[PDB]
């Protein structure tokens, strides 16, 4: 789940 949510953070960021 960090690793997915990683990928996210760096879209909007």
């Known amino acids: ?3 997915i ?3 996210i ?3 909007l960021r």
Do not use: G
Request: glycine share 0%; no cysteine; hydrophobic share 35%.
């Open 1 to 3: 789940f960090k690793r």
């Open 5 to 7: 949510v990683q990928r």
């Open 9 to 11: 953070k760096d879209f």
